[PDB]
RNA sequence: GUCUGGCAUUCAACGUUGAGACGUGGUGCGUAGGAUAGGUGGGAGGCGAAGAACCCUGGCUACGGCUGGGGGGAGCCGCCGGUGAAAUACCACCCUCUACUUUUUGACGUUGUAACCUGAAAAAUCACUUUCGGGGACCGUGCUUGGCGGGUAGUUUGACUG
RNA sequence: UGAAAAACGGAGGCGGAGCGAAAGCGAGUCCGAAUAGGGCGGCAUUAGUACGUCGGGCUAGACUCGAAACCAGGUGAGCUA
RNA sequence: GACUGUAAGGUCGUUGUUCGUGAAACGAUGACUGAAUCCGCGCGGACCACCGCGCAAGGCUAAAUACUCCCAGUGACCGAU
RNA sequence: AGGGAACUGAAACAUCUCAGUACCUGAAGGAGAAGAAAGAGAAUUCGAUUCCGUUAGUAGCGGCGAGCGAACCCGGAUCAG
C-alpha cells in the first residue's frame, strides 16, 4: 500500500511535451524507477517476485516462449510471440553452444506449460541470472489457451540488485488515464497477499528519455 | 501469617514423609580444587543428623 | 494566593535520599541522604481572564501562545 | 508553527517551514511593521497568493 | 552553602579551526574486451554558438586517476563485437572515501537591540515607570558533576578484663 | 431463609509416591560409561483429616510500669537580657 | 402542567508500583526531541521474529466497599476513686 | 491532594520496617475518591472501580538481613449509557 488510488497520477504519466522528453518516430512507454539505501537479500524482506497479470488487453507488450506438447501446439501460439515447439520435435537447444542465447534473452514472461521444466528450463529459464527469468505454471483446466494472453501483456517485476521499484503497466498512447484500477490491481493490489506494511525508501517517478519527476506521501 | 524465608526456601526444602528428612552436606568446591574424591560423589541432600528444627520458618506452607 | 504559579505549579513532593560512589560493583552502600525539595518557573507575559499582575510559568508560553482571552499587546 | 515570509529587506522573502531563531518571530517582528506569520492564511493565501 | 563545566527568556552579521546532511557526485590496475568491469529499468539516437577528435602543460602516482585554458575549431559517440561474477551511456549506485555555491554546530574578538536592572513626569521609598541614559548577553534558576565544608546528621569508636 | 438455622457452595489448600537445582523423570531414584550406594512408591504399610480447651512458639506494646533524649505544632519573654 | 431530553514514546538524574532502582517495558518530572499521522500507531515484563488487544485527544456514572454528630430498639458489662 | 520526620528492629549500627504514620494547609456532600479504557488474561478468552471471601501469605524484593508482597481460578452489592 505505497499509497491509495491516487497515486500514479502525476506519477507515471509524460511524455508528449518538448524540452522533456524527444519527439522519436513513433510514441513510447513510461518508466518508474527509484533509488535506494543500501543492499540486503536473502533472509529478510525484499526480492519482489509476484503474479501480476493485467486485466485490460493493451497490445505487443513483452513475449513468451511455449514447450508444450503434439496434443498442444498450434492452441500455444494465440497471440504471436516468438517461437514454440513441440515436446518429441524439440532437441535442437541442448547440442550447439551460443546459438542457445537467442531464445531467453528477448522474451520477458514465460507460458509454459506444465509439462516443461527441462527441456527448457535449465536451458533457456533460471539459467538467466541478469534477467531474472523462470518457468511459472497455468491454471487447472484441460485447456491452454487464453491464458497466453493473459500473460503476456502482463507487467513483472524481475528481482535481482537493482535500486530501484520498476513497474512496468503497458504503454501511453491509448488511454493512459485507465489507471482507474488496473494500475491498482497491481502494485496497490498486493496488500491482502505479501508481508508488508512500512520502511522502504522514498519513491521516485519520471519520463523516458529526458529528465526525472518526484512523486509525493 | 508466615513469611517462609525464601533464600534457605531454595537447597532443601522438600519434605519425605515417614521416615528421615533431607538436608545439604556441602564441601568446599570452587578454587585450588585438584584433590579429594569421594564427597566428589557425596553432594545434594547431605544429611546433618537432626538439626531441621531450626528451618521451619523458612518454608513449611504451598511450596 | 498570588505566591504560586497560575498554570499548575511544581512543589508539594520531592524529596532526594541518594547514595555516596557505590552502584553495585564491589561493596554494597550505605545511603547517606535523605531531605526535601521543590521546584519553580520564572516570568514574562501580557493577559488571560482574570488580571492581577503576573507570575506564569515556564515551560507555560513557549505553546503557551494560542489559549489567550482577550488580548494582543 | 509554519513559518512563512512576504515582508523582505532580509534574507531572501518567501515562505518556509524553517526557524533559524528560537520561535522568536512574533516578540519582535511584528511590533516594528512586519508580521511573521501568526494565522492560517498559509494553507490558503500560499496557493491563493500565488496564481495568474 | 561556596568553587567549575553543560542548554534556554542570549539577535543578524563578523577574522574561524572542527562537524552532519542535502547536491555533482566522486579512489577501485585478474589479460582481453574499438577499451584494465562490485550497476540496474527505460533506449533509438549521445557531445557541440555555455565551443566538441587532436596537442602543450602544473599538482598526491605500490605508475590508474582528479582540471583548465590554450594549440586544431565543427568534429568525438548506442545496436548482430568479444569477454568478463556483469556490456555500458542518458535518470540512479551503496562501499574505505571529498573540496565547496546553501543550511546547523564550543568559538576566540567586534557593532547594534528584542531577557534586565540603577538617576526626572500623574498624590513624590513599592506598584505604571510614559521618550527614560545605560550596558547588554554578561547577572542567573533549573537537572547533572567535582572539591571543600563537624555549617548541619546518623553511628562507630570493637571487646577482653586474675 | 432470618429472634438459631440451614442445606446449596470443590474459590480453594492441606494430606498426596518420590527424587531431582529444576527440567523432567518415575512406582522406583540424583551419579554416566551406572548390582554398589543415601532417600522414596516403598515399607514385618495409618494414605487421613476437621472442632474445642489445651505443651511451646507467632504476627503485635499486647506481661505493665521507671528514666534524663529525637520531632510536628502551638504559648507567653511582665525571670536574668 | 409551566421546559424543548439527541456536539505524548526517549536519553541522563529519579518518585511510585510488590519491586531498596537494577539482568527488565509501565504513572511522571529536571533540559532537551511535538515524530507517527491508519493495515500507521500502545505494550506482553530490555531486544529479534510472529501473535493479542487497544488508538492522541476531557469528563459523568448514583448501587454496594469504608464513616458514625442525632431518633426507636437492642447486649453471658460496670457500678457512681 | 500540598503533606512528612521520627524512639524502635536488624539484638548496636546511614539503603530499610514504622510510610507516607504525627502536624500543617484546600474542597463539597453527608458523599466525594478509582470507576466505559492507546484494558486484565492467555487454550486461538474476557468489557464499566472498590471491598472482603479464596490464592499467594506464591513471583519478586532485599547491609541478598528482619521484612513488604500483585496477576493466574473464585461471591455479592454491580453484571446500565
Same mark, same amino acid.
Not at chain 1, 497515486?7 to 512507454?29: C, D, G, M, P, W
Not at chain 3, 505549579?9 to 508539594?12: L, S
Not at chain 3, 499582575?53 to 501562545?65: A, H, L, P, Q, T
Not at chain 4, 532580509?10 to 512586519?34: C, F, H, M
Given at each position: 500500500?505505497?499509497?491509495?488510488?491516487?497515486?500514479?497520477?502525476?506519477?507515471?504519466?509524460?511524455?508528449?511535451?518538448?524540452?522533456?522528453?524527444?519527439?522519436?518516430?513513433? &510514441? /513510447?512507454?513510461?518508466?518508474?524507477?527509484?533509488?535506494?539505501?543500501?543492499i540486503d537479500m536473502k533472509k529478510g524482506d525484499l526480492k519482489l517476485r509476484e503474479i501480476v497479470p493485467l486485466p485490460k488487453q493493451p497490445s505487443k507488450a513483452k513475449r513468451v516462449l511455449v514447450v508444450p506438447s503434439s496434443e498442444q501446439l498450434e492452441y500455444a501460439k494465440k497471440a504471436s510471440p516468438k517461437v514454440v515447439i513441440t515436446r518429441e520435435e524439440l532437441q535442437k537447444l541442448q547440442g550447439q553452444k551460443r546459438p542457445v542465447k537467442k531464445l531467453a534473452r528477448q522474451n520477458e514472461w514465460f507460458l509454459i506449460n506444465q509439462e516443461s521444466m527441462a527441456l527448457a528450463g535449465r536451458i533457456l529459464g533460471p539459467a538467466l541470472g541478469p534477467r531474472g527469468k523462470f518457468p511459472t505454471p497455468l491454471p487447472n483446466t484441460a485447456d491452454i489457451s487464453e491464458y497466453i494472453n493473459r500473460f503476456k501483456r502482463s507487467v513483472l517485476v524481475? &528481482?535481482?540488485? /537493482?535500486?530501484?521499484v520498476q513497474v512496468f503497466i503497458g504503454t501511453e498512447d491509448m488511454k493512459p488515464e485507465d489507471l482507474a484500477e488496473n494500475a491498482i490491481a497491481v502494485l496497490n493490489a498486493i496488500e491482502n497477499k505479501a508481508k508488508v506494511? &512500512?520502511?522502504?525508501?522514498?519513491?521516485?517517478?519520471?519520463? &523516458?528519455?529526458?529528465?526525472?519527476?518526484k512523486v509525493k506521501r | 501469617?508466615?513469611?517462609? @524465608?525464601?533464600?534457605?526456601?531454595?537447597?532443601?526444602?522438600?519434605? @519425605?514423609? @515417614?521416615?528421615?528428612?533431607?538436608?545439604?552436606?556441602?564441601?568446599?568446591?570452587?578454587?585450588?580444587t585438584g584433590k579429594s574424591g569421594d564427597e566428589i560423589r557425596g553432594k545434594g541432600k547431605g544429611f546433618v543428623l537432626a538439626k531441621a528444627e531450626w528451618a521451619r520458618m523458612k518454608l513449611m506452607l504451598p511450596r | 494566593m498570588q505566591k504560586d504559579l497560575h498554570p499548575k505549579?511544581?512543589?508539594?513532593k520531592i524529596i532526594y535520599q541518594g547514595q555516596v560512589v557505590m552502584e553495585t560493583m564491589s561493596t554494597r552502600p550505605e545511603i547517606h541522604v535523605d531531605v526535601w525539595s521543590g521546584v519553580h518557573?520564572?516570568?514574562?507575559g501580557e493577559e488571560r481572564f482574570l488580571d492581577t499582575?503576573? %507570575?506564569?510559568?515556564?515551560?507555560?508560553? %513557549?505553546?503557551?501562545?494560542s489559549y489567550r482571552r482577550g488580548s494582543k499587546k | 508553527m509554519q513559518v512563512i515570509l512576504l515582508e523582505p529587506s532580509?534574507?531572501?522573502?518567501?515562505?518556509?517551514?524553517?526557524?533559524?531563531?528560537?520561535?522568536?518571530?512574533?516578540?519582535?517582528?511584528?511590533?516594528?511593521?512586519?508580521?511573521?506569520?501568526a494565522t492560517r492564511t498559509n494553507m490558503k493565501t500560499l496557493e491563493a497568493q500565488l496564481r495568474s
Open positions: 500500500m505505497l499509497a491509495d488510488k491516487e497515486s500514479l497520477i502525476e506519477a507515471l504519466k509524460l511524455a508528449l511535451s518538448t524540452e522533456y522528453n524527444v519527439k522519436r518516430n513513433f &510514441t /513510447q512507454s513510461v518508466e518508474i524507477i527509484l533509488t535506494f539505501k543500501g524481475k &528481482t535481482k540488485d /537493482q535500486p530501484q506494511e &512500512t520502511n522502504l525508501r522514498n519513491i521516485y517517478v519520471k519520463t &523516458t528519455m529526458g529528465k526525472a519527476v | 501469617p508466615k513469611m517462609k @524465608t525464601h533464600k534457605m526456601a531454595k537447597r532443601r526444602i522438600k519434605i @519425605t514423609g @515417614t521416615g528421615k528428612v533431607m538436608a545439604f552436606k556441602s564441601g568446599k568446591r570452587h578454587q585450588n | 505549579a511544581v512543589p508539594c518557573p520564572f516570568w514574562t499582575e503576573g %507570575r506564569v510559568d515556564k515551560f507555560n508560553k %513557549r505553546f503557551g501562545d | 532580509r534574507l531572501g522573502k518567501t515562505g518556509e517551514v524553517v526557524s533559524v531563531k528560537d520561535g522568536y518571530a512574533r516578540n519582535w517582528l511584528i511590533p516594528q511593521g512586519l508580521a511573521v506569520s
